[PDB]
Design a protein around this ligand. Structure first.
Ligand SMILES: [Cl-]
Ligand SMILES: [Cl-]
Ligand SMILES: [Cl-]
Lengths: 241, 246
């Protein structure tokens, strides 16, 4: 499995700040496209700006898209719009959309299937809350979330586990969930999907905590949050080696 | 009250189609900025393209923004982000978001309040469902949606209210001039009696929902109809004829 590092800018950025991030990414030296796959994800309104300024060996993701074809959906952005604009990736089911915008398991599932059929590659996010983990329902929740995406879809998916519950989150806890998610793919979709699908870790990843996580056998990379806005995003990319 | 024509492109557009729409608008002969205030609303991903291409005497609106300041809200676009990109307007509370994305009356009001304090001008959408009209509930519903917006701010100068009955959205069924005039005048009375006479006198109330070049002239003649919010026709040359109903 090729190491995968995605940077989720979330709802952040001005034109000025975007320019400095992109110039910093453009001047960094990282492993080759055969050793790490790098995706950066700006807000909708900056996607074309980053696309025309960023080095082409990094790819761009949108942070969301609509559940079906375009039309009378004020405020929404369709997969075909992103494809028309040369954006190859999309993040779907991020915990903040599941929690704050009330995206259901099946809604996310329908979104993933529709982006995939149109030709987007998808970082599909799953993750359990603090209360869900305290109750012992980590795997049941994460399995139900992944199942809703599988019920509807495999080559062009990266799975991202978000420890929404985190609190200290250990590499061993990451490996437990990643290995349990891969076994779920093995048992429900097929061993080839399990062996080939990248499962990346999305828990407060920083230059300072990434190395021990990246050595875990079933962690295939990272979905980076706040550090994706910072120069240390480059150190996280270099943990691929 | 200056006549006001907004065009909502919804979830529509390609780079080629957007350039063609803007070129059609750039070549149009329409009344002056003293006679009519024109706003066009592309999807997020085209906002900066349209800002560069569009004749500067028309203005641009986003189709939504987040309810508060930015941060950890994946997928959302903040009001300050729009101000940073030079986008002066936003459409908020569109029926497609109230219904399909479950934006509550107070959620829309909180979004309006935040967009206003960050400097945006707001087209705030209200309107009753088919069942609500058929039960005789129209102005109770519209007044309640309006109250939930207006009771969240202390300055209402940059609000344009768009009345779009849900049963007129996409259906080919437009309100009659009499039906629109009834809602717009009764709504303006509500502002007069619950907010203030000056706000009632100055707040543009525009009609949306199946507006066309063929029906816009008679609607525009009604005294409390201050303009239009235009859906599918905003993608067409027909949008120019609606602007000209000013
Ligand atoms: Cl009625
Ligand atoms: Cl319509
Ligand atoms: Cl509309």
């Amino acid at each position: 499995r090729k190491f995968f590092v995605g940077g989720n800018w979330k709802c952040n950025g001005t034109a000025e700040e975007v320019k400095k991030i992109v110039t910093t990414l453009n001047e960094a030296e990282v492993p080759s496209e055969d050793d790490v796959e790098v995706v950066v994800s700006p807000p909708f309104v900056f996607l074309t700006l980053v696309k025309t300024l960023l080095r082409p060996d990094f790819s761009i993701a949108a942070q969301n898209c609509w559940v079906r074809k375009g039309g009378a959906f004020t405020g929404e952005v369709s997969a075909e719009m992103l494809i028309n604009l040369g954006i190859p990736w999309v993040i779907l089911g991020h915990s903040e959309r599941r929690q704050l915008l009330n995206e259901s398991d099946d809604f996310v599932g329908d979104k993933v299937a529709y982006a995939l059929i149109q030709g987007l590659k998808v970082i599909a996010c799953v993750g359990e809350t603090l209360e869900q983990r305290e109750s012992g329902a980590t795997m049941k929740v994460v399995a139900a979330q992944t199942e809703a995406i599988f019920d509807k879809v495999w080559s062009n998916i990266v799975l991202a586990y978000e420890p929404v519950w985190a609190k200290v989150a250990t590499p061993a806890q990451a490996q437990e969930v990643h290995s349990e998610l891969r076994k779920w793919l093995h048992d429900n979709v097929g061993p080839e999907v399990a062996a080939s699908t990248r499962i990346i870790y999305g828990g407060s990843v920083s230059g300072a905590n990434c190395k021990e996580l990246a050595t875990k056998p079933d962690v295939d990379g990272f979905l980076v949050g706040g550090a994706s806005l910072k120069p240390e995003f480059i150190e996280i990319i270099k943990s691929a080696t």
